[PDB]
Design a protein around this ligand. Sequence first.
Ligand code: NGS
Ligand code: CA
Length: 494
Amino acid sequence: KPLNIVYIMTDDHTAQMMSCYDTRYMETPNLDRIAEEGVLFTNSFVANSLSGPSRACMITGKHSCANKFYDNTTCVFDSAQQTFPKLLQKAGYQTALVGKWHLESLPSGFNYWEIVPGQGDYYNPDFITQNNDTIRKHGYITNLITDDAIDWMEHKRDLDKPFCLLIHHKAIHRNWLADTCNLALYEDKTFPLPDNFFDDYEGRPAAASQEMSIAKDMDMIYDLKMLRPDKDSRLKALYEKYIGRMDKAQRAAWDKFYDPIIADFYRQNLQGKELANWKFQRYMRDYMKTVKSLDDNVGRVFDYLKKKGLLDNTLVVYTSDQGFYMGEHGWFDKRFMYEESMRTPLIMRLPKGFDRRGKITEMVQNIDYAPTFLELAGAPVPEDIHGVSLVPLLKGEHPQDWRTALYYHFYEYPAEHMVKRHYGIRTERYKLIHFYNNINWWELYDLQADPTEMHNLYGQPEYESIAEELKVEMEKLQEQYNDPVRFSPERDKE
Ligand SMILES: CC(=O)N[C@@H]1[C@@H](O)[C@H](O)[C@@H](COS(=O)(=O)O)O[C@H]1O
Ligand SMILES: [Ca+2]
C-alpha cells in the first residue's frame, strides 16, 4: 500500500536541545535514533515563528499571507480552506491527530482526533473529543498524548488504509513543568552562558525593545518555580492555577524536589549577572527535565512502530512548531526572524527504498511539509501551495532549480513579548529584515561572518548594492507568495 506518515511535532523544542544537532546541553537518544536511521536537515526554517501560524503553515503549505492565520491572539483558522489532511483523505488515507491543535476551529480532515483546548496543560489536562465534549485525562500530558497515539494505531486504525498520524506535544512549552519521575534530573549540570547572553542590542532596536529577556522578563515564581506565600510576581496567580491542577501525590512529589531549591534561593542575595546566571541554569534544567519525558515518549512511539513492523513503510518525522532561544541574545521564546527562532529542527527516519543517510543542507521550510507528504502519498500536489516537495532531497537529488532564498513574516505586535512585526529574506549568505510596525527599521546580516547576528550592516556603503539586490529578490518572493505587505505596511493583513 502507499507509505504511512507519523509526524511528531513539539512546541518550542529547538536544535540546541537535541544531541543530533548540539552536544552542549541535552542528550536526546530517542530523537537521535530517528535521524540516525534517516536524515537531518541542517537548514530547516519556519515562515512565521509562532505556534498557531506555524501549525497553519504546516497543514496548508502556505505562508500566513495566504492561509490568513497570522498570530495566536486575533485569528481563527478557516478550516474550509485546503489542508493536507483533507487532501490525504481524498487520496484514500485515514488521518489522525492527537494533542495540541492551536488553530481555534475544530480539526477537519481527520478520521480521528482528540486534542487539548488551546495550549493544553502539563498536569491532568482537559481534552476535547471528536464530538467536542470535554474530558479529563489524569496524568502528565507528554505520556497521555503518546498513550492515545499508540492506542489509535493499535486498536482504532483501519488496517486496510494507509495512515497519516499527527502527534502534537505540549512539551517543551513554557513553563516547563516536569513529570514526577524526572523532577531530580540535571541538578548536577551548570552551563557556560551563551557568548551573546549580555547582548546590548547595538544597531537593533526591536532586539532592544522585546520583553523575552531571561534576566529581566522571566518570572521567578511562574518560570523558575520559586513560589512562597510572602512572594509576588506578575504571573504568580497563573502559576498557582497551573500547578493547582496537581493532585495531592503529584504536588507532594513536586514540593519534595522544589522546597529545598526555594529555601536555597531565598537564603541568597542575588542580582545583576549572578542572578541572570542563576535564572539561566534553572531555566535550562527545568526545560531539559521537560525534554526528558518527550524523548522517552518519542522512544515509545519508535519502539511500537518497530515492533509492529511499520517502520519499513512509514515516514517518521520529528520537528518543532518553531525553534527557541536558550539564552542566545539573553532570550527565551521565539518570534524573531533571527536564526535561533527562524530555524526549527527537522529529522526524518526514511522508509525502505530511500537509502540516503546523514545531513541535507538545502534550505527547507515548514511550508514544504504538505507537498512532501502529498507526493509521498501519491496524491496530486495543488499548484496553490507555496512550499516545494522535499522528496527529491530524500532521494539524494540536488535540484538545479532549488530555492536560493526563503521568505519570513511575523505579525504578533503589540502582544506578549513585544516583538515588532517584520518580514524579510534569508539567502544562504545574507538576511535582510524589515521591522515595519511600530518602527521602520531595516537590518542586514552576513550569516557567514556573523552567524549570531550581532552586526547590523544596513546603511554601510559597501553593502548598499547587496541590500538593494536583496530587496528586489524579496519583492519577487512577496509576489510569488502574494504577500500584500509589498504594497504598504498598513496592508499586512488582507
Ligand atoms: C505566560 C506564558 O506562558 N506565556 C506564553 C508565551 O511565553 C509564549 O510566547 C506564548 C506563545 O507560544 S506559542 O503558543 O508557542 O506560540 O504562549 C504563552 O503561553
Ligand atoms: Ca511553540
